[PDB]
A paper describes a structure:
Fluorescent proteins have facilitated major breakthroughs in modern molecular cell biology. They are widely used for studying biological events, such as cellular trafficking and endocytosis, and have contributed to the development of innovations such as multiphoton microscopy, genetically-encoded sensors, and super-resolution microscopy. mKate, a derivative of eqFP578 from Entacmaea quadricolor, is a bright, monomeric, far-red fluorescent protein with excitation and emission peaks at 588 nm and 635 nm, respectively. Structural characterization of mKate under different conditions revealed the pH-dependent trans-cis isomerization of its chromophore, a discovery that further aided the development of mKate variants with enhanced optical properties. Using a structure-informed approach, we introduced a minimal set of two mutations in the chromophore environment of mKate. The first mutation, S158A, has been shown to destabilize the trans conformation of the chromophore, whereas the second mutation, S143C, was intended to impact the cis conformation.
Mutation S143C may de-stabilize the cis-conformation by removing a hydrogen bond between the side chain of S143 and the chromophore. The chromophore in the crystal structure of mKateS143C adopts only the trans-conformation at neutral pH, consistent with the proposed role of S143 in stabilizing the cis-conformation and the spectral properties of the protein. The brightness of the single-mutant mKateS143C is more than 100-fold less than that of mKateS158A, consistent with a destabilization of the cis-chromophore, which was predicted for this mutation based on the mKate crystal structure.
Author numbering: 2 to 62, 66 to 228
């Protein structure tokens, strides 16, 4: 009856290109969906070492593991057993652009992610291609219902060697594989998110990554 249990496991396969460099990854992990925490152990299995900072792939390895507090209707957990998809455009302020499309199915009690990456115009002398990145700041995503699906908007800050940040923006469309007759859509809400790199080995051809993610309505006083 309940398909998303207290502890869930993941398998993931990813394939793409950045600028003109092909590659493939696999990853494997586990998390607690209702606590909104999760870990992925990732391997670059083709085309590594990558000639770009791994950070730009980070947001592409898990929407099921968000703590939907306050009885906010959970669009992603509801979509099972059919599952869902996301597609995203991340636009860097220094030219780089990264689209990704994703499929999330459930199979024998294991979440299965199939990702596809397409990056273009990352400046060759930029911090991404010259590997001067130190992971991401935390962020807030705004989700809102749109066309029987959900949309996400967010700005993210990539730390740089030397103190600075390079900023990017994310437009995400989330689509449920489940008939809209069976889904109870949420209002506008907000996910607070902290995505962190735990460990890495061999020039980022092995990376461990963690996320904590908690959904909430705006908690400030209203006057309307």
């Amino acid at each position: 009856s309940a398909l998303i249990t207290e502890n869930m496991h993941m398998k993931l396969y990813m394939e793409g290109t950045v600028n003109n460099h092909h590659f493939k990854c696999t990853s494997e992990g586990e998390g607690k969906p209702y606590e909104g925490t999760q870990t992925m152990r990732i391997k670059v299995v083709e085309g590594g070492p990558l000639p770009f900072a791994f950070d730009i792939l980070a947001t592409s390895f898990s929407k099921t593991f968000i703590n939907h507090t306050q009885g906010i209707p959970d669009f992603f957990k509801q979509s099972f057993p059919e599952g869902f998809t996301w597609e995203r455009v991340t636009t860097y302020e220094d030219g780089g652009v990264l689209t990704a499309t994703q499929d999330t199915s459930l199979q024998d009690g294991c979440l299965i992610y199939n990702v596809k990456i397409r990056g273009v115009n990352f400046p060759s002398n930029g911090p991404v291609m010259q590997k001067k990145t130190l992971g991401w700041e935390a962020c807030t995503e705004m989700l809102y219902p749109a066309d029987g699906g959900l949309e996400g908007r967010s700005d993210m800050a990539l730390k740089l060697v030397g103190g600075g940040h390079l900023i990017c923006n994310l437009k995400t469309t989330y689509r449920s594989k489940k008939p809209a007759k069976n889904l109870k859509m949420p209002g506008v809400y907000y996910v607070d998110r902290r995505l962190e790199r735990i460990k890495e080995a061999d020039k980022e051809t092995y990376v461990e990554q963690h996320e904590v993610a908690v959904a909430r309505y705006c908690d400030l006083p209203s006057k309307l």
